[PDB]
């Protein structure tokens, strides 16, 4: 999965159509390469590795374009999540103050998102077989098994919308027609994300209230998508939201006198070693470990440099994991170019990421909290 990122800009901003054409050529030629045109108008490319990206830059700058194409220094895409449910009901009342949705947020069951991703569960199933898997494998409760609505953001995605307005579910001959509208808001929001414009990760929004207006022309469709997005975001924001970065895996072949140098290399890059063994049938050693990604730049370079070509590593995507930080902590100070001591990684991540994409300065847990003004 595309987690590694590059920010590109030509020295000549006027040749920019040409560099764009080149990024189109490489998006066609390298099958795992993704291109994004970010919120400040920058060119970004989503890939999966460093030699990968270097092939990309060689080919763009030389064989698919002829441009002097500056590169910034890379970063990885994060995801937004909640480990705590909203202490209060987070609501959005439609512009015509006649409809209103109240939702809550909470973390999913830990393996449910990974099962979704592996494609063992799908909304495609009927309600009964969906509940079958849910209850039989996760001891799920009957009411929410009957009322699981859709999956966010994408078809096989880590988030869910659940119904729990069973007294106002009795209006289902009306609640159904706005079911699709509220899930349009749900998926749109659970894709965008309020904290730092990164995907909501393994979260579930429960409808605690849905008050409808029985005039279809009044209620429309263009207000129930945004209000549903807004209750998604208000629930996500009244939950204390947490960032997630990848944890790449690394398998190393190293001789007798080099595994501890590898230990220092990893524990320098915030890694931990799951496996340290001799390679059966070989005089070499195998080292399996896990590493954070923004430290994973130059990992293999410096790693083979440390034991002089003897160490050798491969790295790939494994999973995402919480960085030790809190994003909406305005009592966190960051010096603009020194690195961050570990207590405050997610704060720097969120603020630097919103600034780099081009968004505003501050986010509030009551930003989407509707106006009684």
């Amino acid at each position: 999965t595309s987690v590694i990122k590059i920010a590109v800009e030509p020295v000549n901003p006027s040749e920019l159509p040409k560099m764009l054409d080149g990024l189109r050529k490489v998006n066609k030629s390298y099958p795992s390469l993704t291109t994004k045109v970010e919120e400040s108008g920058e060119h970004v490319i989503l890939g999966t590795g460093e030699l990968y990206l270097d092939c990309v830059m060689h080919d763009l700058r030389k064989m698919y374009s002829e441009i002097d194409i500056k590169v910034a220094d890379p970063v990885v895409t994060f995801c937004e999540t909640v480990v705590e449910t909203s202490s209060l009901k987070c609501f959005a009342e439609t512009p015509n103050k006649k409809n209103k949705i109240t939702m809550i947020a909470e973390p999913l069951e830990k393996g449910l998102a990974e099962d979704i991703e592996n494609e063992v569960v799908q909304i495609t199933w009927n309600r009964k077989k969906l509940g079958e898997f849910f209850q039989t494998k996760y001891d799920w409760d009957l009411l929410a098994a009957r009322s699981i609505w859709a999956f966010g953001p994408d078809a096989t995605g880590p988030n869910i919308l659940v119904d729990d307005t069973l007294p106002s579910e009795v209006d289902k001959a009306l609640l159904g027609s706005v079911k699709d509208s509220i899930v349009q808001g749900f998926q749109w929001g659970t894709r965008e994300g309020p904290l730092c414009d990164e995907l909501i990760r393994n979260v579930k929004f429960k409808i605690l209230d849905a008050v409808v207006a029985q005039e279809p022309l009044h209620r429309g469709g263009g207000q129930i998508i945004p209000t549903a997005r807004r209750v998604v975001y208000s629930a996500f924001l009244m939950a204390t939201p947490r960032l997630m970065e990848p944890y790449y895996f690394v398998e190393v072949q190293a001789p007798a006198d080099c595994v501890s140098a590898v230990y220092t290399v990893l524990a320098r890059r915030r890694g931990h070693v799951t496996q340290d063994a001799p390679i059966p049938g070989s005089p070499l050693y195998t080292i399996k470990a896990f590493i954070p990604a923004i430290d994973s730049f130059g990992f293999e370079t410096d790693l083979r440099t440390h034991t002089q070509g003897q160490a050798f590593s491969l790295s790939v995507f494994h999973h995402w994991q919480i960085v030790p930080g809190d994003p909406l902590d305005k009592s966190i100070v960051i010096r603009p170019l020194e690195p961050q001591p570990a207590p405050h990684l997610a704060r720097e991540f969120m603020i630097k990421t919103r600034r780099r994409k081009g968004l505003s300065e501050d986010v509030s847990i009551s930003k989407f909290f509707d106006d009684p003004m």
Partner: protein, 154 residues
């Protein structure tokens, strides 16, 4: 003319022995990953320097949003010289990865040439049940008319 030599392999091993002190013991190109022609001409044109490497002239001559855990280094700008390196000129393609070669030296003669050296690790072929095949059970029929011997027996 003394042109165009050819030898025998025992003489080859003897010359190897006599020159053993002026001969590197390198089998792979994993020593000069960052130390080779490509990365050193990269360094020349980029005006970059590597710890144990040569130096040269130059061929020519926002703060908020940066995410920092460990530093984007110079040898990194040499090993991936396109990414962490803004504006590359005459920049070569690093990361040539030769398989880390297993080589075990002969020390004392007895030691048949192909014998499990102490440094190599026990095999321990281990997994779940082996498997079945519809193997050709006997009592149905088979038998060979006999000339056969292994391809090298003498």
């Amino acid at each position: 003319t003394y042109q165009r030599w050819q030898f025998t392999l025992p003489m080859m091993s003897t010359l190897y022995r006599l020159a053993n002190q002026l001969l590197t013991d390198l089998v792979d190109d994993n020593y000069f990953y960052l130390f080779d022609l490509k990365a050193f001409f990269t360094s020349k044109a980029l005006n970059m320097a590597i710890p144990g490497g040569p130096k040269f002239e130059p061929l020519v001559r926002d703060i908020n949003k940066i995410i920092i855990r460990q530093p984007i280094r110079t040898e990194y700008k040499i090993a991936f010289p396109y990414l962490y390196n803004n504006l590359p000129h005459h920049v070569h393609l690093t990361w040539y990865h030769t398989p880390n070669v297993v080589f075990i030296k002969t020390e004392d003669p007895d030691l048949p040439a192909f014998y499990f050296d102490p440094l190599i690790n026990p095999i321990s072929h281990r997994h779940s049940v082996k498997s079945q095949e519809p193997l050709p059970d006997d009592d149905e029929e088979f038998e060979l008319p006999e000339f056969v011997e292994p391809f090298l027996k003498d």
